Write a protein that binds this ligand. Structure first.
Ligand SMILES: [Mg+2]
Ligand SMILES: [Mg+2]
Ligand SMILES: [Mg+2]
Ligand SMILES: [Mg+2]
Ligand SMILES: [Mg+2]
Ligand SMILES: [Mg+2]
Ligand SMILES: [Mg+2]
Ligand SMILES: [Mg+2]
Ligand SMILES: [Mg+2]
Ligand SMILES: [Mg+2]
Ligand SMILES: [Mg+2]
Ligand SMILES: [Mg+2]
Ligand SMILES: [Mg+2]
Ligand SMILES: [Mg+2]
Ligand SMILES: [Mg+2]
Ligand SMILES: [Mg+2]
Ligand SMILES: [Mg+2]
Ligand SMILES: [Mg+2]
Ligand SMILES: [Mg+2]
Ligand SMILES: [Mg+2]
Lengths: 74, 185, 118, 124, 76, 262
RNA sequence: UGAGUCCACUUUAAAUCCUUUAACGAGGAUCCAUUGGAGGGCAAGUCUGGUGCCAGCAGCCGCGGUAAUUCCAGCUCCAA
RNA sequence: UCGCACGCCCGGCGGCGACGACCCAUUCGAACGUCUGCCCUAUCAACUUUCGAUGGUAGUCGCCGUGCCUACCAUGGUGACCACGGGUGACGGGGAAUCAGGGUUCGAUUCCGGAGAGGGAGCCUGAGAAACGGCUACCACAUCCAAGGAAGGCAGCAGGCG
RNA sequence: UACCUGGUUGAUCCUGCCAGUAGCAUAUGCUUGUCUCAAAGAUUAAGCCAUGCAUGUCUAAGUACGCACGGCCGGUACAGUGAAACUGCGAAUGGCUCAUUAAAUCAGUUAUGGUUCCUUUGGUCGCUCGUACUUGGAUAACUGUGGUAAUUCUAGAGCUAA
């Protein structure tokens, strides 16, 4: 469920997207008062979440988001 | 660096004065006589006539018994004979200047179909050309601007895939026959 | 940063390195590139010291001298085989070439011999 | 009612084949398929249709004539010796791999980064 | 609120500039047919939405990436 | 440019190759060899564009790598080998020997010869060099360095070499009355007898050559190749026989023959 | 009869388009061709209603100050 | 040096090739040169010159000829036939448009040659580079960082900001 | 196609310019049914670039002891494919742009008798007069220890070929 650290959530979310691209969506929760970031991918069967900020993760999260958008379009 | 031609040329040149009444009179008489579509159809034949007359003037500016002049004159007379505007006994490079837009428009396949009489009207002949009912030397001609050669003049007839010739009837005839058989039973 | 023979410092020195020098592999043919190394004089500014035991002492260390590790490959040049087996110039090398046994699960046991050069 | 004539007949002993320009007359129907072309050339030249390869049809206007090029090999071994793999795969004796070209370029640039034996371990 | 692709980015920048003190930023990306992707943003009070088509993803994703890299900062 | 050129554009190709404009951007750049860039004709153009034996350059590569093409007594495996003037291409399986002689126009001609004629060829020498021990050397147009020649062979002469041994059999000295193949320029393809030689110090010399039909013409000696003594050639000649009759006479010989054939 | 729809060849490295080809497919054949102008240069309304030197038109001359052949709308016509 | 067919003598002689190179030619070229030709400007009339300007002599260096450079001498060289200086919203040409005959305007643009990879400068390798999808230093712009350090050049194909 | 017209005046004849008139480009507005070709970040910014790709390559004929596969005729080395690596060649070609440049580039014409030149081809390659049945030791790929936050960073120890 809570695949933290790194690459576990990425492999699990790529598996969720390659299961079905239609019903799957991704949500992104940004917080500045507490200052943390949250990614959650769901495919209306299970929901997989990722809750850390760690400064450097912003670039790889937006690259994963732009990869998901390119896979939705192409 | 790509492999293509980039070679093209305007076949028509617009006149210098746009609203000459006598010029519009002459062009309107030409279109109403020979069944044309626009003024560009007049202007492109006028510009090909301008090409031929410019070549003729360039030959007459040359000296007699010049080899380039004789070769180009004989080739241009051969072209005029094979398009059938100038006669085979009349062929001389001085008679090219006395040639006319009416005699150029007489060799249109629309006009030749109208003169052979297989079509009723000139525009009805153009309808037949558009609807692909006639052929020239076992080849369907879809475009009325086909310059018919004198050797290929006698081969104008109806095409094989044509209801007016020896072929299957058209869509309206099939629909009326199907409606009649459906009404009969 | 690795060390370098013959720079005679103890700090950090940036040097031009080409083909035929230490701590640099040329990618293009004859490529020169600045690389940063440390002086050869041993001081406290070091993480690792590389040590090569030349003379063996009285005691026996269980880590290094106890575990005997054999050669990985055998002699391939015929002159080197002659120098190893004390051979003459007329005797055979084909009989005395060193061949390696190969054995693992699934596959058959084999014995692979090197191509003798020269 | 389909008629096949041959023009520009040439015998390439240096390619071990025959070649000609094929002229197909088919009134009252569409363009006939290459399988029927190979069958009619086979029953014309008294050979097996496996060696006859025909490609490149162009249909004239009006709809009664096509022009195509075709070669007639001596054997299937000679055909596989000098015949392009794409026209072999048109009929199905050869099957090219399905590795996409951009992913092959990406695999090559990933093998360029890692030096050593692990170039094979980078791929999958 | 269904807006233009550029107006969506400007209002999304205004959402972060309003949430520089307190408030969440919700970004929802999903497939859209009625190739298109639905991208929606919500602060909790004002919702904005857009549909990105295939004709504008190269124009959209790069500025959206620079917007995210400029607007998101967590802990060191 | 920072070095030598390896590509050749299709537009930048010379006119006598007759390569078409629409099919390709690049032309087959010939490799270095016994002939110049704009004087030779490549093997891929001779095999694919003229003989029409192959369709594509891959097929030309297959033909040259099955070891079939035999250029002047040796197998060349390159598709861009420079095959120039008086080159003999032998194909064994078809049994065809070809001698690259120019046509009456600027182009080369597909010229069928016998094996008795393909055994030898003729080459114009360019200079005589004295080697390191006083040894005379001929430098031919196809870069053949033949040593110990006949000392009557001079700078502007031709030699009849043998393909099997690479030695001279006979020679033609550049004299008046001999035949003349014109190898280059506006008179490329003419065949006639030499009627005048005009020397020039500094500026290049010129030769007036008279046609058999009386059409005399001047040509510089750099594009001149004698092919025999008097009016008797030692090779076989293509149709047309090197006259370059007028365009009106060409139109007549086309049109009258066409109307007679029907 | 196409334009479209669309099985099937052909095309092509694999496709697309062209050509071929079945079956559909047109009477306001609504399956509706617009772009500028109508005082002169410059082809083509002293037609009708409103505005009254205001709005505006006009590349030049000029039109509009309550009967505008020049504006704004309808009809008609002219140029391509 | 390496690979294929595998023979004949009284251990030794043998073929077809591929590869490695002093030197001479040939080809691909490269570069200095000979003559002729380029838009506007005089509110640019004199310009260059012991910091090479124009030549001679003798050398260095260059792949070679040369003030290319060095040492000593001569005071020379260009210009009203427009030098020198400046501007170009000027890469040059084959060519494009308009055209009676004459001209005018454009040419960045698929072919040939020149220059370049943000601005200059230097160099290894290599026949061929002062190469930037090669390096070495400085300036402008910019990435990661543990604050010791490392790495960049789309006037290439797509595409993005301005 | 070697072409005119309106406008100074109460009216006329001249000079004169303005306005039309007709093409080739550059952008824009309206509209658009078919089809063959077809320009396309040049003009202002030769301004800046996230991302992916664009130059790598093995034949019977330069090196094969990575079982990574694989054949049995082995004991007289190497049956046969082949990762990686050493070596040779290419990367100085092609593509993009016109910033700089006005006897400069470039175009016609010339010579290198004033020079080089990988490759290809043709010559030469027992011409010399003084262990060869084949000479030496390093090194990469292989095994094993790591350093850095991090590089297409690399080292120490064993090996082993041209
Ligand atoms: Mg009106
Ligand atoms: Mg008017
Ligand atoms: Mg009027
Ligand atoms: Mg008006
Ligand atoms: Mg300037
Ligand atoms: Mg230009
Ligand atoms: Mg510019
Ligand atoms: Mg450069
Ligand atoms: Mg550079
Ligand atoms: Mg480059
Ligand atoms: Mg680049
Ligand atoms: Mg007055
Ligand atoms: Mg008046
Ligand atoms: Mg005007
Ligand atoms: Mg159609
Ligand atoms: Mg269509
Ligand atoms: Mg720009
Ligand atoms: Mg730039
Ligand atoms: Mg280039
Ligand atoms: Mg400029």
């Amino acid at each position: 469920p809570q695949y933290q650290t790194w690459e576990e959530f990425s492999r699990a979310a790529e598996k969720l997207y390659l299961a079905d691209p239609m019903k799957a969506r991704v949500v992104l929760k940004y917080r500045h008062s507490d200052g943390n970031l949250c990614v959650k991918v769901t495919d209306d069967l299970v929901c997989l979440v990722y809750k850390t900020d760690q400064a450097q993760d912003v670039k790889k999260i937006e690259k994963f988001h732009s990869q998901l958008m390119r896979l939705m379009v192409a | 660096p790509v492999a293509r031609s980039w070679v093209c040329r305007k076949t028509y040149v617009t006149p210098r004065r746009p609203f000459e009444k006598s010029r519009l009179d002459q062009e309107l008489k030409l279109i109403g006589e020979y069944g044309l579509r626009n003024k560009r159809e007049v202007w492109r034949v006028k510009f090909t006539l301008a090409k031929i007359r410019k070549a003729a003037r360039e030959l007459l500016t040359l000296d007699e018994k010049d080899p380039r002049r004789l070769f180009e004159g004989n080739a241009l007379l051969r072209r005029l004979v094979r398009i059938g505007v100038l006669d085979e006994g009349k062929m001389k490079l001085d008679y090219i200047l006395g040639l006319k837009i009416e005699d150029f428009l007489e060799r249109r396949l629309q006009t030749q179909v109208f003169k052979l009489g297989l079509a009723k009207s000139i525009h009805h002949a153009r309808v037949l050309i558009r609807q692909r009912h006639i052929r020239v030397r076992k080849q369907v001609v879809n475009i009325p601007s086909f310059i018919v050669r004198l050797d290929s003049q006698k081969h104008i007839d109806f095409s094989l895939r044509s209801p007016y010739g020896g072929g299957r009837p058209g869509r309206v005839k099939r629909k009326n026959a199907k409606k009649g058989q459906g009404g009969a039973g | 940063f690795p060390m370098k023979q013959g720079v005679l410092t103890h700090g950090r020195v940036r040097l031009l390195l080409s083909k035929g020098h230490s701590c640099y592999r040329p990618r293009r043919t004859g490529e020169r590139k600045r690389k940063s190394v440390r002086g050869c004089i041993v001081d406290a500014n070091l993480s690792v010291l590389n040590l090569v035991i030349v003379k063996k002492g009285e005691k026996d260390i269980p880590g290094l001298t106890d575990t005997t590790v054999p050669r990985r490959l055998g002699p391939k040049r015929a002159s080197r085989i002659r120098k190893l087996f004390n051979l003459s110039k007329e005797d055979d090398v084909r009989q005395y070439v060193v061949r390696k046994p190969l054995n693992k699960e699934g596959k058959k046991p084999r014995t692979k011999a090197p191509k003798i050069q020269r | 009612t389909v008629t096949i004539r041959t023009r520009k007949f040439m015998t390439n002993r240096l390619l071990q084949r025959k070649q000609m320009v094929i002229d197909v007359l088919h009134p009252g129907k569409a363009t006939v398929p290459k399988t029927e072309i190979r069958e009619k050339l086979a029953k014309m030249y008294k050979t097996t249709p496996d060696v006859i390869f025909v490609f490149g049809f162009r249909t004239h206007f009006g709809g009664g004539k096509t022009t195509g090029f075709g070669m007639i090999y001596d054997s299937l071994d000679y055909a596989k010796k000098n015949e392009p793999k794409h026209r072999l795969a048109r009929h199905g004796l050869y099957e090219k791999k399905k590795t996409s070209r951009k992913q092959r370029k990406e695999r090559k640039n990933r093998m360029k980064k890692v030096r050593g034996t692990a170039k094979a371990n980078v791929g999958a | 609120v269904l807006l233009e692709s550029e107006q969506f980015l400007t209002e999304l920048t205004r959402l972060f500039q309003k949430c520089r003190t307190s408030g969440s930023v919700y970004i929802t990306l999903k497939k859209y047919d009625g190739n298109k992707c639905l991208l929606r943003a919500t602060d909790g009070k004002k919702k904005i939405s857009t549909v990105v088509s295939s004709k504008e993803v190269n124009k959209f994703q790069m500025a959206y990436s620079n917007l995210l890299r400029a607007n998101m900062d967590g802990l060191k | 440019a920072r070095g030598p050129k390896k590509h050749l554009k299709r537009v930048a190709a010379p006119k006598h190759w007759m390569l078409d404009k629409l099919t390709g951007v690049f032309a087959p750049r010939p490799s270095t060899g016994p002939h110049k860039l704009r004087e030779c004709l490549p093997l891929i153009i001779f095999l694919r564009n003229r003989l029409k034996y192959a369709l594509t350059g891959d097929e030309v590569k297959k033909i040259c790598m099955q070891r079939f093409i035999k250029i002047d007594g040796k197998v060349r495996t390159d598709i861009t080998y420079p095959a120039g003037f008086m080159d003999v291409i032998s194909i064994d399986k078809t049994g065809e020997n070809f001698r690259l002689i120019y046509d009456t126009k600027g182009r080369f001609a597909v010229h069928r010869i016998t094996p008795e004629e393909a055994k030898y060829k003729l080459c114009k020498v360019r200079k005589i060099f004295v080697g390191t021990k006083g040894i005379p050397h001929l430098v031919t147009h196809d870069a053949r360095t033949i040593r110990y020649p006949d000392p009557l062979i001079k700078v502007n002469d031709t030699i009849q070499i043998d393909l099997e041994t690479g030695k001279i059999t006979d020679f033609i000295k550049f004299d008046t009355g001999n035949l003349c193949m014109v190898t280059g320029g506006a008179n490329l393809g003419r065949i006639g007898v030499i009627t005048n030689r005009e020397r020039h110090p500094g500026s290049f010399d010129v030769v007036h050559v008279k046609d058999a039909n009386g059409n005399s013409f001047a040509t510089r000696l750099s594009n001149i190749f004698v092919i025999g003594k008097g009016n008797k050639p030692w090779i076989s000649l293509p149709r047309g026989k090197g006259i370059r009759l007028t365009i009106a006479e060409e139109r007549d010989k086309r049109l009258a023959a066409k109307q007679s054939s029907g």
